[PDB]
Structures are given as C-alpha cells and as structure tokens.
C-alpha cells in the first residue's frame, strides 16, 4: 500500500495566520492526492483535489500544490471556523489510502471559565440516584481543573468539547454521581476550579 | 441538492452483521460510483470499498475481503454495506461517499451522514432525560446557563437540540462518558439571557435512535 505522512499532527495558529500543511507519499502518485476537512462532528469535505484545484465552493483562501510525492495544503487567512483534522488522501493506487490528519486548533486570548454547579434534578432524586454537575463554559487554553468538595472535603466524571468555531473556547462538564441517601446526607456541594485565566480558584457551590 | 441519507446506528454483538443503507436523491444515482469509508472512534480514515451503480460490480480494500458485500437497488437508489462477522474493533462510523462523474477521478464530493455501528454484547438502553435547571447559581451577569442529563443509555449516539432546532447558539452538548455501569452519559446546556427566563420556554429534543426513544423535556427556573 502507499502511506501518506502527514505534518505536523497538530497545530495552534492565529486568526489570519497562514498555515500550510504536508503530505508525503510513499512513491510516486503524480498528482491524485486530495485533501479533506473534518470539522468536530461532521463527516469529511473534499477541499481540494488533484494536489490543486479548489473543489467548487470552497473558500478561495484554501490552496493546495505538488506532484509526485511531496503535497502541500494551505490557507491563506485562518479564520476561526477553519478548527478541523485535515486529512490528504491519494488514489493513484488501489487501496485508495489517507494520511493520518492533521489536528488544527485556533491559538486565541486567555479566557477563564464561567464556573456553573447544578443540584441533582427531583426527577432523578424519584429514582434513588443524584447527579450534581459542574460546568465550565467557554474558557481558553483547554488545560483546567476540577475539584470536587463534598462538605468542604472519586466517582466524577469529566468531558471536553471541541475548540467552539465561533468564540475558539472549550467547555467542560463534571458530574458527580451519588446515591440519594449519600446526596441526602451531605450539605455543601462545590467543585473547585482551577484554571490560568483565574488568578485563584474559584470555588462555585450550593446547600442542599 | 444532492443528499446521501444513511442507515441509523445500532449495536451488534461480536460475530453477527450489520447492513448500512445509503438512499441517494438529487442525482442520477447510476452514472455515478459509490464508495464507503469508516472511521473508528477518535481516528483516521479507512477506505474499504466501491460498487459501480451500474451492474453492481464491486471491489474492496484487502482487508475487509471475505466480510464485506456491497450492493445496490436501482430502483430505490439505496447502496447498502454488509460487514460480516463483526469484531470488536469494527466499532466505527461508516460513510457511504460519491465521487464525480467517470465520463479515473476518486475523491469524495459527497458524504452521507455516517452510521455509528457499535459491536458489543451489552444491549440496548434507552435514556433517562433530566432537567439542570437554570438557578441563581447558574446566572452570570444577566447570563443563565440551563441544560439537560441524558443519562444510563446504549449505545451511542444520542442527538440533542433546543427547541426543535430554533435555539442554536450558546449551545454545547458534551462528548458521551462511558459510566462505570457500562453505560453512557451525557448533558447538553445552553447560555441564554437571564431576561429570558420569565418570557420564553426551553424544551430540549433528546433522540436516541437504537433504542426509538425521542423526548421533549422542558427546562424551568428553580
């Protein structure tokens, strides 16, 4: 089979940085190479095909070069939905074979968490069980901490989403899972917050 | 506009088959070829095949040689997928793609929406939907934060909007956790004015396709 290498993995630019990204084949392909873009959550996007040319209605900021075995894949002007894995594909060759991906995050300004705590719905409370979830919303770089404190101090789970293509923040979501004797039992629920936008914890609480 | 529709995903246990549909419109479906490419979870891409639309000729990536069939109704225009003896590692999204008109020209113009199917031996739950609910504690500056739990559900996926799709911005449904029950959670919430609360009405549309659960839970102020 042909491999494609991809580079770099990953990368943070700037809004209105120029990006160029890499694919290297195996052997020699000529120039049926393709480039795609996976945005979080959706399927694949032929961006541009035979090495160069723009797929109709995409953006002209996207461009693409090479032949034989060295690809290049560039935008000219990052702009802040372009948060995707990009992914090259050749097809001189069956099996048709892609590249790895390439990671592409926006670098933007520090932004620290808004900190969010939500009690245990009634609903959930009929069943036996309480969930109590910690959000935190729209904060940049990913990096943050959770702390749960059950009456001022092991079973919390966390979930990071995508870099958001509009503002390029991320969102977090804790839940601390109890059973409703043990929710009934304690008094103070927080989850402590640690992040570099903050210059110090936040502690975000409630009583039961 | 051209439209590929896929099958929904489902759960299989380890040694069965799943068939995923591909129903095509808003193109003369034979003059093209068809392909299918799957992506397991948190990584890259993988051809495994192409069928011609016309006659149905096939032919399949290597590794998938002796599992896969690949076929098509041109009556229906549906392409169809069977994976065979599933494996663990066959837990993917798979996509059916076409490429241009051939008058050799593969690159994928169109994709459908992907089909999670998921190979395990546990069975198929549908979720518990709760309200978080938009408290004082959840207020920031005249900014409110609400949201809904799905929780105790299986396989994945499950889709959520707001108001029937009418409230998009502000919006984050989280990746699913995978509980130590076996089992997946999930909450989504949106940021709204603090305004809103007294005037308008929340209702989020959780959709678990595998088990055919679709709630409609409101939101209120606590």
């Known amino acids: 089979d042909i491999q494609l290498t991809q580079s770099p993995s990953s990368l943070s630019a700037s809004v209105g940085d120029r990006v160029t990204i890499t694919c290297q084949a195996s052997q020699d392909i000529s120039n049926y190479l393709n480039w795609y873009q996976q945005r979080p959550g959706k399927a694949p996007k032929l961006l541009i095909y035979?090495?160069?040319n723009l797929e109709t209605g995409v953006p002209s900021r996207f461009s693409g070069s090479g032949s034989g075995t060295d690809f290049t894949f560039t935008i000219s002007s990052l702009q802040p939905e372009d948060i995707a894995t990009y992914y090259c594909?050749?097809?001189?060759?069956?099996?048709?074979?892609f590249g790895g991906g390439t990671k592409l995050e926006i670098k933007r300004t520090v932004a620290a968490p808004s900190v969010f705590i939500f009690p245990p719905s009634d609903e959930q409370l009929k069943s036996g069980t309480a969930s109590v979830v910690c959000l935190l919303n729209n904060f940049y770089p990913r990096e943050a901490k959770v702390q749960w404190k059950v009456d001022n101090a092991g079973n919390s789970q966390e979930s990071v989403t995508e870099q958001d293509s509009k503002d390029s923040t991320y969102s977090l979501s804790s839940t601390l899972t109890l059973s409703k004797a043990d929710y009934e039992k304690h008094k103070v629920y927080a989850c402590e917050v640690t992040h570099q936008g903050l210059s110090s914890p936040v502690t975000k609480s409630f009583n039961r | 506009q051209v439209q590929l529709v896929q099958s929904g995903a489902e759960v299989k246990k380890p040694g069965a088959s799943v068939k995923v549909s591909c129903k095509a419109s808003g193109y003369t479906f034979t003059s093209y070829y068809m392909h299918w490419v799957r992506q397991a979870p948190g990584q890259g891409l993988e051809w495994m095949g192409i069928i011609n639309s016309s006659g149905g000729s096939t032919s399949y990536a290597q590794k998938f040689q002796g599992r896969v069939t690949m076929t098509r109704d041109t009556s229906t225009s549906t392409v169809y997928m069977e994976l065979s003896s599933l494996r663990s590692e066959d837990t993917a999204v798979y996509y059916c793609?076409?490429?241009?008109?051939?008058?050799?020209?593969?690159?994928?113009?169109?994709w459908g929406q992907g089909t999670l199917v998921t190979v395990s031996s546990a069975s198929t739950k549908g979720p518990s939907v709760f309200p978080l609910a938009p408290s004082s504690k959840s207020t920031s500056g005249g900014t409110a934060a609400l949201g809904c739990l799905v929780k105790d559900y299986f396989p994945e996926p499950v889709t959520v909007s707001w108001n029937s799709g009418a409230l998009t911005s502000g919006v984050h449904t989280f990746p699913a956790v995978l509980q130590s029950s076996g089992l997946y959670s999930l909450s989504s919430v949106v940021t709204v004015p603090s305004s809103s609360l007294g005037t308008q009405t929340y209702i989020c549309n959780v959709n678990h396709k595998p088990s055919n659960t679709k709630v409609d839970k409101r939101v209120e102020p606590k």
């Open positions: 035979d090495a160069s």
């Open positions: 594909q050749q097809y001189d060759n069956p099996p048709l074979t």
């Open positions: 793609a076409r490429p241009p008109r051939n008058y050799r020209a593969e690159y994928f113009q169109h």
